[PDB]
Design a protein around this ligand. Structure first.
Ligand SMILES: Nc1ncnc2c1ncn2[C@@H]1O[C@H](COP(=O)(O)OP(=O)(O)O)[C@@H](O)[C@H]1O
Ligand SMILES: Nc1ncnc2c1ncn2[C@@H]1O[C@H](COP(=O)(O)OP(=O)(O)O)[C@@H](O)[C@H]1O
Ligand SMILES: Nc1ncnc2c1ncn2[C@@H]1O[C@H](CO)[C@@H](O)[C@H]1O
Ligand SMILES: Nc1ncnc2c1ncn2[C@@H]1O[C@H](CO)[C@@H](O)[C@H]1O
Lengths: 338, 327
């Protein structure tokens, strides 16, 4: 094995700015959700937006910058164009130390982008134009790479493009056949409605081993307001399934075993963007260096919470080095012994 | 008059990331300085650089956004390309409410970009590739706009590209011909060595009324370690000049007059990039709505301070708000 984690997901650059509640209703944007938009809507939304800040995103791409940051070894397959947006995206995931070799488009569509509006509550509302991401398919599976990677992890978000599901059946095959595990995030609670069924059967066929989701996503995957009930069904359909509970932290599920680890207490909720992504990043960093579900959920919340103190979805410095070093400096500020 | 401040400057997109000191010196990057680099040095540095975040920059660009955020009317001249970086630069400065109409390049060179390496002390070391910026010249001056703008502010950083200074001699001329005032920033201590003489002439000719500078730069301008000496000469070469002094604040100079104002005291110095630029924004916003020198200095320090507690060279927050909230 050469990689702990491989992620496959929509390669997306994030253009982010603050706005208020009325902005989102005035523009018919769904608060909290990922809104899918054509290129004309990306241009229109952009023009109505305040000055923004741009940062590499992509749900799966974040989770791989995550693992690399935590200390792990990671690799990523994404769809980007031969343009300035893609050249940045490329560099950003590489400078994490992730393996990124996927071939870029060469003209239109241009690199995918997402108009991310953060409200005062740290909630984030996304409006994503897929660009280059629709061209992602089976041709883009690096073969050797899926085989050398302990987990393979990929977005529900990948159902939207046309032929990403076929780059997926395929990496699920390659990876299982090499004694490896497959993982997914449910992405968003509307993705969940738009592919309830594709998602389930994709679990039941034991194509996907591990399932990450937030509470709404889980409630909605089994069309229900009963959360306990939903925890059972989710246990039946995969080996392993982690569920984010925002501030409550997490509840991992394995048959009737339910590891509830709680979440840090945060200074401010600045920008929620990137949380679930970094929860899973930490968790899998734990999981692929053999660690308890207990110490896994912990690595989860720890990583989530750091990224929520930030305009942006990705740690711009090694969490390995920072989290340790923070911890040392508090100790010595509190005049405590190590 | 229609605009309070017009700035003219190297239009640049900042690419920003952390590094340590050792990194700067393995790459022969002068710390705290602005380092010019060809396209090939850009690709190379970029690859050696950690994950970055990106934001509209440009010394004059920031200053113009600054004036708008505070509530003033601003405009900007600078050269971008018809590419994705140019499109962002364009959006950000327009979304501040700044007037920007300068026509982009179409093709090569591409939109300028500066790789800004921030060390732990929040000093910032910049490696800028001018790209589309060399294409800036007299043809890019909007005559009516310069005549309509109470102050016309421009970077000393514009003596690096070939024909920028010509656009400049033109705009100073249009401005004085309409009863307006021109200002400039000395930009970088090294920029100062590179043009020590042009700059002084710019002043003594009365082309530049007002001068903005930090401490190191004021000294370079007169090659002297005597700071008061440096201040005396500066009062002789221009109508008015403001010198920022980091944590000490600013001192402003007008003949024999010396208005010193302290900096706000800060919680965190995160990223020092943009400080000299927002200082001038605050100062010129106060200056162009008829405020005393003291109040100009306060507004300058307020805005410098807010931006230094932030990754990115332009404040995320509404400055008109922070100015009102501080009374
Ligand atoms: N309000 C909060 N306070 C502290 N940590 C939080 C908070 N919200 C989210 N997190 C962290 O990031 C993860 C994901 O948050 P969650 O609400 O489950 O939804 P999502 O996947 O939509 O971002 C958490 O499980 C946790 O570690
Ligand atoms: N350490 C600091 N604490 C509070 N304010 C500061 C600090 N450093 C700079 N400033 C603010 O930014 C302005 C620019 O400071 P200076 O270091 O002289 O700028 P430059 O970035 O042009 O070298 C100051 O006049 C001040 O208001
Ligand atoms: N349709 C999408 N597919 C994959 N990632 C997305 C999509 N829409 C938004 N994102 C990513 O979601 C992240 C956090 O959940 C962001 O950084 C952003 O890039
Ligand atoms: N050669 C240059 N001319 C004008 N502004 C620059 C130059 N290089 C970097 N900058 C900008 O200087 C700022 C603060 O001084 C940053 O936003 C950065 O983009």
């Amino acid at each position: 094995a050469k990689y702990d984690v491989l992620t496959i997901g929509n390669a997306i650059v994030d253009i982010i700015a603050r706005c208020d509640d009325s902005f989102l209703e005035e523009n018919g944007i769904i608060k909290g959700a990922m809104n899918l938009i054509n290129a004309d809507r990306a241009e229109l939304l952009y023009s109505r937006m305040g000055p923004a800040v741009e940062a590499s995103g992509g749900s799966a791409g974040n989770t791989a910058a995550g693992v690399a940051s935590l200390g792990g070894r990671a690799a990523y397959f994404g769809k980007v164009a031969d343009d300035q947006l893609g050249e940045i995206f490329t560099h950003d995931i590489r400078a994490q130390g992730v393996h990124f070799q996927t071939k870029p488009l060469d003209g239109h569509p241009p690199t995918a982008r997402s108009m991310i509006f953060v409200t005062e509550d740290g909630e984030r509302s996304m409006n994503t134009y897929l660009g280059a991401c629709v061209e992602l398919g089976p041709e883009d599976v690096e073969d050797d790479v899926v085989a050398q990677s302990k987990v393979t992890y990929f977005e529900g978000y990948l159902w939207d493009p046309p032929r990403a599901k076929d780059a997926i059946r395929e990496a699920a095959r390659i990876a299982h056949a090499h004694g490896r595990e497959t993982a997914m995030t449910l992405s968003d609670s509307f993705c969940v409605h738009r592919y309830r069924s594709e998602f389930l059967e994709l679990m039941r066929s034991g194509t996907v081993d591990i399932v990450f989701a937030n509470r709404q996503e889980a409630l909605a995957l089994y069309e229900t307001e009963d959360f306990d009930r939903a925890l059972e069904l989710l246990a039946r359909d995969c080996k392993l399934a982690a569920v984010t509970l925002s501030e409550e932290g997490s509840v991992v599920v394995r048959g009737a075993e339910r590891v509830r680890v709680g979440a840090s207490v945060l200074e401010q909720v600045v920008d929620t963007t990137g949380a679930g992504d970094l929860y899973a990043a930490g968790f899998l960093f734990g999981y692929t260096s053999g660690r308890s579900l207990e110490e896994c959920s912990k690595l989860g919340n720890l990583a989530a919470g750091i990224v929520i103190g930030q305009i942006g979805p990705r740690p711009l410095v090694s969490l390995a080095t920072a989290a340790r070093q923070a911890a040392l400096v508090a100790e010595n500020l509190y005049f405590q012994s190590h």
